[PDB]
Design a binder for this molecule. Structure first.
Ligand code: CL
Ligand code: CL
Ligand code: CL
Ligand code: CL
Ligand code: CL
Ligand code: CL
Ligand code: CL
Ligand code: CL
Ligand code: CL
Ligand code: CL
Ligand code: CL
Ligand code: CL
Ligand code: CL
Ligand code: CL
Ligand code: CL
Ligand code: NA
Ligand code: NA
Ligand code: NA
Ligand code: ZN
Ligand code: ZN
Lengths: 374, 377
């Protein structure tokens, strides 16, 4: 009997391409209801979510997503992406690593924990979405809005996103950068190269602004974050003709920003720089996430202790990579840490996860439950 | 009135031929029959899809008239008052594709030749025509290939009048005595593509290029001269990225064009750009293309004859300018010829309801004839 592997395989075969749950939450809700959880479904548009809880008081929530990213050309995978296969101790399939293995490990951890501590003094909760990977307008963000609107208690959140580099627990994420995109259009006057005095080239007018923008140091980072990083992802002007002076320049730049900056600080600094260079512009901002950091506390201690119990060495506490639905849950004032399997193969062809690592992760999750909720 | 209006008659005949570049649509056969009838020798020079001819009468000091039989597409036939290939006279104006650019000029210069030869049958100079069926499109197989053939055999060509429509309001108010060169740089700045989450593994070529672009757009190239404005540099195109806000691009494309005066060589422009690229320690690939060299006829017998002919018939001296419209002048300038452009009002060229003033065509033919008499009688 391998309940963690068996449940992971059941999840992988369900092709839950965001935002379609494809029956994953029906499986998890059955398991949680069987050990005494109250489940509230919170479905918005085409996204399925649930908030499940057992007990009262000091609250530890496990967070995760049932959705997976598309497999790409399925016929190029060694085994079909939705046909989980074990070979040489690796479980292959879309979502094996991101993050159906983690979902299975946290459900089985809860079953083993509730068996050991049927009258645990704390509250154990799950916050599960069918859209973390795509637009995510209708997933965890909407559950958190609902929970904050009813003054829900949530002290600690373990996000099961695959945090690990080479072995489970080598790395845990104790924070994530914000992401803010500036979609900037510099307006000029379109014309012809034969008569430049009748045109105003926005590429020429923008050049001093772009030179200053790429030289700015936005912050110096802190103990847990590197310096805020600004990158020009896209730039475009012209019709493809060598005799047209373009009328518009489009520049898109992204900020992956530390807790040293807010989106409003970055926006004000950018608008000030546009004003200093006297540009005519239209701007559209995208805020895809706010930074969060859990520097210390009972949750960090519990995660470090659970990992150390098996690995001896403490996990590195990092803020690397993208973000997670932790960014939403952090709005509740919760401590938020991410612990999950090796992330090397996420979003790639032949995604897989070490089966022994999933079993170990389930034991680490159970130890976190025991420390915080028993 | 065809028996007393030979310029208008030959213009309307040409307009009827849908000579969309590069199809002559039979226009050159009409010009060749008229020149052969007055003792020209004609040498057709056809290259692939394009028809050209070199025609001459007499010997020695040579004045060539240059022009093209091709016209640009009419566009939306519904927006035309009369069909674009159905020449119509309304209010002293001849309407039709090519009326202004440049079938009126072609008619004027052929009739001027007929009158000139009638007046000076044993003229002491050589009068020539260099006609192409592709000035307006690629022009790979037009005037450029004729000039290559003439230069290969050391053909004499002292003076060239290009009949491109030069005028603003009244025929002869402007003559073009030069044109700017055109030089384009297709620049790639090389970087290393990556992901915004891991910027130290990438090298954003937009960021590396920003100081270079800032300096490039601030350079002053020349201050032009009596006949040219300052050399003009414009960035026509710039592109980088995949369209995703999470990708650091690996390559930046920049295209910039120079419209340069006779005061600067293409060599000097390229050197300054390479010096700036090297100063900025960039990884790059450049692809240069020279569309044309500048040319200038500041003074001499041709400028005098054109100015004298226009003044004789208008009593106002043409402005001598170097911008606006296009011509094959730059190719003929390679032969060391004096090159000037005189033609009708250019307001309606490449537009719906293109037209030319009928009386202005008659006057242009007389100006052309006076230029022939001054230089090759
Ligand atoms: Cl198992
Ligand atoms: Cl949805
Ligand atoms: Cl336990
Ligand atoms: Cl208990
Ligand atoms: Cl444009
Ligand atoms: Cl957020
Ligand atoms: Cl006439
Ligand atoms: Cl012949
Ligand atoms: Cl005469
Ligand atoms: Cl004679
Ligand atoms: Cl970084
Ligand atoms: Cl970079
Ligand atoms: Cl790229
Ligand atoms: Cl040239
Ligand atoms: Cl001279
Ligand atoms: Na309790
Ligand atoms: Na002679
Ligand atoms: Na000047
Ligand atoms: Zn995930
Ligand atoms: Zn023309």
């Amino acid at each position: 009997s391998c309940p963690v592997i068996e449940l992971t395989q059941q999840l992988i075969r369900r092709p839950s391409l965001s935002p379609d749950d494809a029956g994953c939450q029906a499986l998890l809700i059955e398991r949680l209801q069987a050990i005494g959880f109250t489940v509230e479904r919170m479905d918005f548009a085409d996204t399925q979510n649930f908030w499940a809880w057992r007990g009262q008081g000091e609250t530890l929530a496990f967070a995760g997503h049932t959705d997976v990213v598309p497999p790409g050309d399925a016929d190029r995978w060694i085994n079909p992406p939705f046909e989980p296969t074990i070979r040489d101790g690796m479980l292959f399939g879309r979502g094996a690593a991101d993050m159906k293995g983690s979902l299975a490990a946290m459900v089985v951890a809860a079953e083993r924990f509730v068996a050991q501590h049927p009258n645990h003094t704390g509250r154990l909760a799950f916050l599960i979405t069918s859209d973390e990977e795509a637009s995510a307008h209708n997933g965890t963000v909407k559950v958190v809005e609902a929970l904050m609107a009813r003054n829900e208690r949530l002290d600690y959140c373990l996000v099961g996103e695959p945090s690990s580099i080479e072995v489970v627990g080598d790395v845990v994420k104790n924070g994530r950068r914000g992401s803010l995109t500036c979609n900037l259009t510099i307006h000029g006057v379109q014309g012809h190269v034969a008569y430049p005095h009748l045109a105003d080239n926005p590429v020429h007018r923008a050049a001093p602004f772009l030179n200053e923008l790429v030289a700015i140091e936005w912050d110096q980072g802190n103990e847990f974050f590197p310096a805020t990083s600004m990158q020009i992802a896209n730039i475009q002007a012209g019709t493809g003709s060598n005799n047209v002076i373009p009328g518009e320049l489009f520049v898109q730049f992204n900020f992956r920003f530390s807790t040293e900056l807010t989106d409003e600080m970055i926006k004000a600094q950018v608008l000030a720089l546009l004003e200093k260079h006297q540009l005519r512009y239209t701007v559209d901002w995208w805020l895809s996430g706010q930074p969060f950091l859990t520097a210390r506390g009972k949750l960090v201690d519990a995660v470090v202790n659970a990992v150390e119990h098996y690995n001896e060495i403490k996990p590195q506490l990092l803020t690397t990579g993208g973000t997670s639905d932790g960014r939403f849950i952090a709005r509740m004032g919760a401590q938020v840490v991410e612990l999950g399997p090796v992330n090397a193969t996420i979003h790639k062809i032949n995604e897989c996860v070490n089966a022994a690592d999933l079993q170990l992760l389930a034991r680490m999750y159970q130890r976190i439950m025991e420390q915080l909720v028993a």
